[PDB]
Amino acid sequence: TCPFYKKIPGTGFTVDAFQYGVVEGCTAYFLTHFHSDHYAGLSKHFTFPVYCSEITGNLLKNKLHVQEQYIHPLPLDTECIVNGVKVVLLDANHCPGAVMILFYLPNGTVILHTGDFRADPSMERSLLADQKVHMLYLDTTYCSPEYTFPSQQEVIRFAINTAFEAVTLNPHALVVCGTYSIGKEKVFLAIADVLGSKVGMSQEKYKTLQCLNIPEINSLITTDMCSSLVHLLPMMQINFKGLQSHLKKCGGKYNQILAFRPTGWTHSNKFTRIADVIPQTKGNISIYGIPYSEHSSYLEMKRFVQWLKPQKIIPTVNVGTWKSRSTMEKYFREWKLEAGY
Ligand code: NI
């Protein structure tokens, strides 16, 4: 059955709750973003109302084949009424079309559901600042102090300079970027822009990008692999064997590969800075691991919550074991005692 952390008290709403069949009492199902864990269970067979951003609606329609009559897209930063209740969608700074939802309950309680998010200080001057928020449903992915990472901009700068140098040294080098869902598109778009190239990709991946309301998208991407010097492949193929194999397929148009694996955190965040990063190399193929995150670091999450001063926090990630819940509760209490709420 649908857990209490996916239910909004004193409404018939749920959030990211599509895997449990019909939820008893639910009149509207919200979807924060188009990642499979969150949408799991949605298909052309679903016949209840779904509320979401415009981008998330394009994806539901075109990729999942959810029928149009059930898609209710809402604009961002706008007070809207849903089934008698005031809501606002806000940018979550996660992947394209990802939202946080603000719910103003009839009794006067205010609830923020973050979805998946990367906390940023620009969120401190949104509509959130206008009133007290009583309850917070929080993306706790990286809720432990070891989880540090550079800014998105530091990581992009590094990727840009690295790719530019390699292709100026060898104009027959190909650049490859790994991918498994939506998100982290700036990696491959910024590399292609410094090289004066479009991004080449499969038909399925191109169809995904064509849903994302990216300005001038037709000038940035193509299905003609031949004509382009940055290619996208599934993350699973970003290894020496997969990359040599792809290089055979391209028709000796390239004689070297430089590849990027954008990942979350892995244990080497605790010493290395982005400027120290060096690749793994075997022959004419090099692979760089770059920690481009679309989730809050511990420090970014702590700042956001200390500003917001919620009366209660409800975790939405790593809630499956008592040890994790216990550890998270300890950090929430520290934050509260330091900030005085
Ligand atoms: Ni996500």
Curated annotation (Swiss-Prot):
Q: What is its main location?
A: nucleus
Q: Name the UniProt key words of this record, in alphabetical order.
A: Cell cycle, Cell division, DNA damage, DNA repair, Hydrolase, Isopeptide bond, Metal-binding, Mitosis, Nucleus, Phosphoprotein, Ubl conjugation, Zinc, Zinc-finger
- List locations, semicolon-separated: Nucleus
GO biological-process terms attached to the record:
cell division; double-strand break repair via nonhomologous end joining; interstrand cross-link repair
Q: Which tissues does the record link to its expression?
A: Expressed in brain, heart, kidney, liver, pancreas, placenta and skeletal muscle.
What does the UniProt entry list as the effect of changing residue 295 to A?
Answer: Impaired nuclear focus formation, reduced interaction with PIAS and increased sensitivity to cisplatin
One example GO MF annotation: damaged DNA binding
One GO cellular component assignment for this chain's record is: nucleoplasm
Expression induction per the record is: During mitosis. The mRNA encoding this protein contains an internal ribosome entry site (IRES) in its 5'-UTR. This 5'-UTR generally suppresses translation while specifically promoting expression during mitosis, when cap-dependent translation may be impaired.
Instruction: Name the source's superkingdom.
Output: Eukaryota
Tell whether Ubl conjugation is among the UniProt keywords: yes
Q: What does this protein do?
A: May be required for DNA interstrand cross-link repair. Also required for checkpoint mediated cell cycle arrest in early prophase in response to mitotic spindle poisons. Possesses beta-lactamase activity, catalyzing the hydrolysis of penicillin G and nitrocefin. Exhibits no activity towards other beta-lactam antibiotic classes including cephalosporins (cefotaxime) and carbapenems (imipenem).
On assembly, the entry states:
Binds constitutively to TP53BP1. Binds CDC27, which is itself a component of the anaphase promoting complex (APC). Binds PIAS1.
Q: Which family does it belong to?
A: Belongs to the DNA repair metallo-beta-lactamase (DRMBL) family.
In Swiss-Prot or TrEMBL terms, this protein is called DNA cross-link repair 1A protein
Which source organism?
Homo sapiens (Human)
Please give the range of the full-length protein represented by this chain: 700 to 1040 of 1040
